Structures are given as C-alpha cells and as structure tokens.
Write a protein that binds this ligand. Structure first.
Ligand SMILES: Nc1ncnc2c1ncn2[C@@H]1O[C@H](CSCC[C@H](N)C(=O)O)[C@@H](O)[C@H]1O
Lengths: 44, 58, 362, 395
C-alpha cells in the first residue's frame, strides 16, 4: 500500500538534517566453480 | 536424543533405525547421519563475504 | 654469443613489464610481430631492419585494474587469423584477434590469479592456465567447453607458477613454490576420449553440462631439485630444465640415466641430475628466460641487467662455457626475454617499462 | 557493426530505465506484482469467475496462459494469484508463503497464437496454434496435471483454416459461435453448441473471404450477435453482418490507417464506439454511423501497436501497448481539454496515463472483472506484471 503521506518540509528537512520469494541469485557448479543453468538445476 | 549418541540401528528398534536400512524415510529423526539423508544445497557468492551456501528447499 | 643490442624502446606508463611473446605462429615472409603485456596495457610491435621497431596496435585494460602476467600467441584455423591470449592477477583469460581488434572469448573460473599460459604444440585450441589456487584447468576454446582439470586432492599443496608442454604434447611438467615436480601424461588413454568429446558438445543437446575430468596422480613427483622457489622449467626434449632463485640452472631426467621418461611409473622417486649452467645476481624469482625456435640457443637476462647465454649444442655443463652479454644502459631488472622464430632477433624487456632489442651479430 | 554496438549500449539503457522506473514506481503505483515464468507465453487473459476469501485481503484470481519454448513440450497452463483487496493490511501485506502459483498443465502443440474462453462457459476454451486446426479444450474434463506422454486431446477442435493465424472472437450472444482469422486471408466460423460427436474436429461452419491480405483480427459486436468486423494487414477494415448472402462482400468498409492494422475493439457500453489501433504508431476509433470521418486519433506510442482493450466499469478509458515497450492510457472525456503548459509539455489532455515498467516488450495486457484499476501484462522476458495506478489521477 502506498503510504501517500502529505508533504511537510518541517519534518522533511529535519529528517534530512523487499518481499521477495524464490531462488533469486544465480548459483554455480560447486565441483568446478562454473555457472549452473536452470535446465539442470534439479538433478545436480 | 538427550544423550549425545544417535540411536544405534541395532538399538532403536521402535523407531525403525534397523528397519529398511536401504530405504531413506524412517519414523526416527535421530538416525539420519548413519543414513546420510543430506539435503540438497546451492553454492552462490554470499552477500556477507565471498562464496556462501543457499538451501534449495524449505 | 654473436649478439649486440641494436634497439631499445621504453613504454611511457612506467609500469612493471611482464611476459613477452613473439609470433612464431607465422608464415615465411610474414611481418615479424611480437607482443608484450604490461600492468594493464597490452602492446604489440614488429621488428625492422637498421634497428628500427615499428609500434603496432596497442590496447589497455581500462576496466579491470589488475596487473597482466602471462600471454600466449594464438591462431585460428577457421579464419586463418592469429590471436594472442592474455591473463593477469584476476585470473581471467582474454583472447584478442588483431584482425578483429578485439577479444570475444571470455573464460573465468580460476580461483585467485593466473601465472602461466601455453598452448598445445599441435592443437591450437587447447591451453593450460596454471593458477594461484594450485589448479590446472584445460579449456577447449574451439568448443568453449572445459576439459579435464589437474591437481586436486593430491596435487601441489602450494601455488604452481611454471609448467611446460613437451615437443609433441604428451607429458606436462609442473613446478611451484612448493618446489614440487609433478608431470602428467596427456597420452593417457582416458584423456583424448574427453578431448575428442570436448570437441563433441552442444549446450542445447541436453540439460547435462559437459563433464570435464579431474586428475590427482602425477606420473612422477619430487622436490629434491631445489631448496628455494622454482620458476623456470622447460622440456629440453626428453630432458627437463629447471631454474630456482638460488642462482643455478639444472637439467635432469627421471630415475636413472638409462630410464625411459615414458616408462617411468608414478611410484618412481629417483633423480638423475645433469645440469650446472649456474648464474648469479638473480636471487629473486619471477624471472623467465627465452629459447630459440630450433632449441639450439639459451639466453637468460639478469636482475642487474646482464645476460647469461648458452647454446643447446654439444656444449654441456661439463664446462658450461657461458656467454655473459651485457648492455650498460640496462641494469634495473630484466623481467623476461623472447626470441624470434629464428636465432637472429632477441628482445630483452626490463621491468621499468623499457625494452632492449639485441640482434644477432652473425 | 555500430548497430550491434548501439544495441549493446541499448542493453545498458533498458536496464537503467527499469532501475529508474523501479525507483519511482511505489509513489505512482498502488500495487506492484512481479513474477517470471519458465517459458514465455504469447497471450494471457483473466478468468471471469472470481472469489474473495472472507477476512482476507488477498483475492483469489485465476489466469490462463500458453507455453512457448525453444524445443521442449509446450503446455496449456492456468495459474492462480492472490491480490490484496484491502491495502490497509500490512510478508509485506500478507503471509510469507507467496500469493501466486500454477495449478493446471496440459500438453500444448507449438505456441498459443491466440486463446480465449467462450463467455457462456469459460471452462471451454479455443486456442490458435501453429497447426491449421484450432484446438479446443476444457480444463474440467482434462487432468490438471501435465501428461508426460506428450499426447494432447484437442477435443472438439476446429478445422477450416488452411494455415495458422491470429484473431479469435467468440460471439457474445451466440453460444458456440466464434470468428477466427488466418494467413489464408479467410475468416472461419463454427457452431460449438451444434457440434456432434463428429470426431472432435469441427470444420468451419462459415468461411469469409473479404480482406485481400492476411486477415489478422476479427471480432463480433459486443452487443449484437449479427454484427461483426474483421481487420487485416490490408490497412482496410470491413464491417460484416451475419446471413448477408455472399461471404466476401462486407456491409461496410474503410481504410483505418496508412500502415497495417491488426487491432479492433468495440466499446462494451457505447454501441457506436469502435476503437481501432494501427502499426503506424497510431490508434483511432470510428462510429457505426460515421465511417468516413475519424472521430479521433492517438499517436503517443513510439512504435507499432496491436493490442487494444476497453477498461471495465470505465467507458472513458482505453489502453493500448506494443513494441515500444510502453503502455498508454487515454481519457476520452479529456479529449482536447485545456491544460496547463506543464501538462501539454507532458502530454495531451486525452492521454490518461503512460506505463513503461518492463525491460522486454509486452505482447499482451489484460484487466479483469471486479478490479477495474489493475492490469496484468505479459512481456517477452516471461515477466507477469500487475499494478494499480494511484486513485489521485482519476480523483
Ligand atoms: N560474517 C563474516 N564476516 C566477515 N568474514 C567472515 C564472516 N564469516 C566468515 N568469515 C570468514 O570466512 C572464513 C570462513 S571460509 C568462508 C569464506 C567466505 N564465506 C567467502 O566465501 O568469502 C573465515 O576465515 C572468516 O574469516
């Protein structure tokens, strides 16, 4: 939900003064330090 | 389990430690290391420092 | 012996200089092109008469802030275009085609750094990149597929930096800071199967990636040759050269003097020492010598800037009639040397971005 | 070449734009969903049926898609998704378990050129395939699990087109009546309600040969079962009526634009309004009475457009997207309305909104009933995008 807070400089200047899911990053072949492919990502 | 000893296959006959040594799934949970029911892992560059380990399954 | 400095050029970057390479992969009458790797710059030149040297196309690694260490001339049979692979401290291989003016083959996977580069004498598509993590990996660049890896569980427990192919490409010597002398036989029945299969691979063929192999059992090993770091070994035919920081160069053969190199079992441990072409003023490693094309003439520089020169003829370490050529202007550190595809042109490179060409006085 | 070099530079650019778009996205969008699929799907559409669980903001919605792969088996897939009906519930809004998944897989042949559910029973669907026969399926009879044997059962599939093509439209009033377009320059019709146990393949009930070029779009009037029109690459569209004697002479005809046209969309509310895009960066509309005069034209898109749709619950809203990797929203009530110079420099008053949050080109975008303020969209990068605009733009 966007917070949609109203603009206020008295608070803004004074202050100035991620729900991911799944296998995000790429994984590598442990035996040989080589990048995996999703095709063989299961039997490995 | 209170002991540091894994229930020996020849002893925890009630949890099937001896039963189906060939099979992978048993009633017991403190018999795995003997059977080596390891989980599948993934190797990736860790966010913290260099290489790291990531788990494939929940 | 019949040599003198006739040319000398210095790079303006003042960075330490590294491995030199002369394009012996040429044809009769081709322009005589040689290459050299600096810190991050790569430069090529062609020797010319009268002592002139014409600077050729030169590049710089303006993206990777690393010191390049090794390079090796390359050739493509398909396009008949020569190339030259490079490597450095970041352990990444780049192969630039002068015809393409660029590198389009990217190869990574080594651990820390690369300290040796050399091609197979017969197949130009096979390369050994000795690495800092004690690893010996092989690449099939033509198929871009990896080939068997050497070292592993029973490999060198220290960083290897020096290795060599034999003349026919059948056994590969390896030596590192552990002073170990491990070699592996290419002709091993298993490998060429993989090498053949290395040339037979399609990424779209199946989900299963190519299976490069692993080796841990050299056909021989030892450490008695040197009590200090070894950084220069070469295949003198069936004989093995070896140089350390201890200001000596020694040639030796496995087992007894009558023992066949190819008959030696891995369990063997005996040594036959027949080399005493010793030197001095070069008590530090990371110096590499040069060889003539025909394996008849040895020239080694010096840290104090002199030359140590011997022939590969019947002249033997029984007396070791040295030829200590020297140019007064070069005394800082002779990092490497490089012969042409003949014995007429010698290019000596100093560390301080300066090179010193010596032409044969015949 | 420089073009290869510039494209490589362009690869950096699109990554930058997505990063920049992501940075500004939360303050301009009220919902941000993203999901990547194993194999790209050409088209997607919402199931009309919907259910909202009690005491749970996330609403149960179902989506149907196809499969496009390099060399593997393709499947017909139906996937479910949960979206917060209440945004007051702050595992950002719901549980950490995830709110999207796939439930149905059936072996598919080639790639889904076009597929839709027939309105009177969404369970039965027809799918345009690279093969000449138009395949027909109902997920109720077929198993949800994929069949690894590779066999497919296109029961009650449709014959009549010589080759594949694009363009599918069920009759909104007549059950089992659908118009399909093909590269055969012909429009074929079927009557599923009248289909017997003839062998699960149905020949074209009626074949039309009006357009000279490859007919690529054909649709029934959203209110009239008799009225329908077709759109082809001939840059000329023609209006048709059922039972009108010869099938090659249209009731009406007009050239939509100066380039190929492959997108047609009638207004569900206004009978007369019929929106027509074009490949010449131009989208327009026509009147059932006034065929000779174009009502208005829209040309904000920077590339070809071939997907157009009218917003549900919103007669004044029309959207279109294409190869420019941009989606343009337009306000009909704001056509020619005076605006501040800070607005004209931004866009025309009729231009409602512009969305560009996708690295890859989007081939399909689809809203759903009960949720007029969200749009699903399928890009080439297997990315499923669902997003809600701020209410502030429409007050
Ligand atoms: N949280 C942490 N922060 C910094 N260094 C860490 C660390 N956890 C482990 N290390 C270092 O990592 C070494 C363990 S081996 C693991 C190395 C690390 N995961 C990498 O790939 O780079 C230890 O010697 C320790 O010094």
């Amino acid at each position: 939900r966007p917070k949609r807070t109203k603009a206020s400089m008295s608070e803004f200047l004074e202050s100035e003064d991620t729900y991911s899911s799944g296998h995000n990053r790429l994984y590598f072949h442990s035996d040989t330090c080589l990048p995996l492919r999703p095709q063989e990502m299961e039997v490995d | 389990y209170l002991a540091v000893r894994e229930c020996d296959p020849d002893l925890c006959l009630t949890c099937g430690a001896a039963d189906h040594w060939d099979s992978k799934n048993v009633s017991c949970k403190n018999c795995s290391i003997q059977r080596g029911s390891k989980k599948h892992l993934l190797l990736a560059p860790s966010d913290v420092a260099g290489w790291g380990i990531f788990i494939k399954d929940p | 012996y019949s040599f003198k400095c006739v040319n000398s050029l210095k790079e303006d970057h003042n960075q330490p200089l590294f491995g030199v390479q002369f394009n012996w992969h040429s044809k009769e009458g081709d322009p005589l092109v040689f290459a050299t790797v600096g810190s991050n710059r790569v430069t090529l030149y062609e020797c010319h008469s009268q002592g002139e040297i014409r600077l050729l196309q030169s590049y710089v690694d303006a993206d990777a802030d690393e010191n390049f260490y090794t390079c090796a001339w390359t050739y493509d049979s398909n396009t008949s275009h020569p190339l030259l692979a490079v490597a450095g401290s970041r352990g990444i291989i780049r192969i630039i085609n002068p015809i393409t003016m660029q590198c389009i083959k990217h190869y990574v996977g080594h651990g820390n750094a690369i300290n040796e580069l050399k091609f197979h004498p017969r197949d130009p598509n096979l390369l050994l990149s000795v690495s800092k993590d004690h690893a010996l990996r092989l690449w099939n660049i033509q198929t871009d597929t990896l080939v068997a890896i050497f070292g592993g569980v029973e490999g060198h427990r220290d960083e290897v930096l020096s290795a060599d192919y034999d003349l026919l490409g059948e056994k590969i010597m390896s030596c590192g800071m552990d002073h170990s002398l491990k070699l592996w036989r290419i002709n091993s029945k298993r490998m060429m199967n993989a090498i053949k299969e290395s040339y037979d691979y399609n990424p779209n063929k199946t989900n299963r990636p190519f299976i490069s192999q692993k080796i841990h059992f050299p056909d021989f090993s030892t450490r008695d040759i040197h009590r200090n770091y070894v950084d220069c070994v070469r295949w003198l035919g069936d004989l093995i050269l070896s140089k350390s920081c201890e200001n000596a160069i020694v040639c030796w053969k496995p087992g007894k003097m009558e023992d066949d190199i190819d008959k030696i079992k891995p369990s063997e441990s005996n040594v036959t020492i027949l080399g005493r072409f010793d030197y001095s003023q070069c008590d530090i490693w990371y110096m590499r010598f040069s060889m003539d094309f025909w394996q008849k003439m040895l020239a080694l520089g010096n840290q104090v800037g002199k030359l140590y020169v011997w022939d590969l003829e019947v002249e033997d370490p029984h007396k070791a009639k040295c030829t200590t050529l020297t140019h007064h202007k070069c005394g800082a550190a002779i990092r490497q040397t490089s012969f042409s595809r003949d014995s007429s042109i010698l290019i000596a490179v100093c560390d301080d971005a300066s090179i010193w060409r010596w032409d044969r006085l015949r | 070449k420089e073009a290869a070099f510039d494209d490589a530079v362009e690869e950096r650019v699109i990554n930058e734009e997505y990063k920049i778009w992501k940075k500004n996205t939360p303050f301009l969008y009220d919902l941000v969903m993203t999901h990547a699929l194993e194999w790209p799907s050409l088209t997607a559409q919402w199931l009309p049926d919907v259910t909202r669980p009690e005491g749970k903001d996330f609403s149960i919605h179902r989506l149907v898609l196809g499969t496009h792969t390099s060399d593997e088996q393709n499947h017909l897939v139906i996937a479910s998704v949960q979206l917060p009906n209440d945004d007051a519930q702050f595992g950002g809004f719901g549980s950490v378990s995830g709110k999207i998944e796939i439930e149905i897989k059936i072996n598919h042949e080639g790639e889904v050129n076009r597929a839709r559910y027939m309105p009177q029973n969404p369970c039965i669907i027809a799918t345009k395939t690279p093969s000449s026969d138009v395949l027909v399926f109902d997920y109720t009879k077929h198993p949800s699990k994929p069949d690894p044997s590779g066999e497919c059962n296109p029961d009650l599939r449709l014959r009549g087109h010589q080759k594949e093509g694009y363009g599918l439209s069920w009759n909104p009033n007549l059950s089992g009546h659908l118009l399909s377009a093909s590269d055969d320059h012909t429009i074929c019709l079927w009557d599923i309600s009248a289909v017997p146990k003839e062998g699960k393949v149905v020949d074209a009930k009626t074949i039309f040969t009006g357009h000279t070029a490859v007919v690529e779009d054909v649709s029934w009037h959203l209110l009239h079962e008799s009225l329908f029109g077709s759109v082809a690459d001939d840059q000329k569209l023609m209006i048709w009526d059922t039972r009108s004697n010869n099938t090659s002479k249209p009731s009406h005809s007009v050239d939509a634009h100066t380039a190929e046209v492959n997108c047609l969309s009638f207004n569900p509310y206004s009978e007369f309004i019929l929106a027509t895009g074009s490949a010449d960066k131009t989208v327009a509309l026509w009147d059932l009475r006034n065929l000779k005069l174009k009502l208005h034209s829209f040309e904000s898109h920077k590339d070809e457009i071939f997907q157009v749709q009218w917003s549900p619950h919103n007669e004044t809203i029309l959207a279109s997207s294409g190869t420019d990797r941009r989606l343009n929203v337009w306000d009909l009530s704001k056509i020619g309305e005076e605006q501040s110079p800070e607005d004209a420099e931004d866009g025309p008053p009729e231009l409602l909104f512009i969305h560009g949050g996708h690295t890859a080109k989007i081939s399909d975008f689809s809203w759903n009933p009960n949720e007029p303020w969200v749009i699903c969209s399928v890009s080439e990068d297997n990315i499923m995008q669902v997003w809600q605009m701020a209410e502030n733009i429409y007050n």
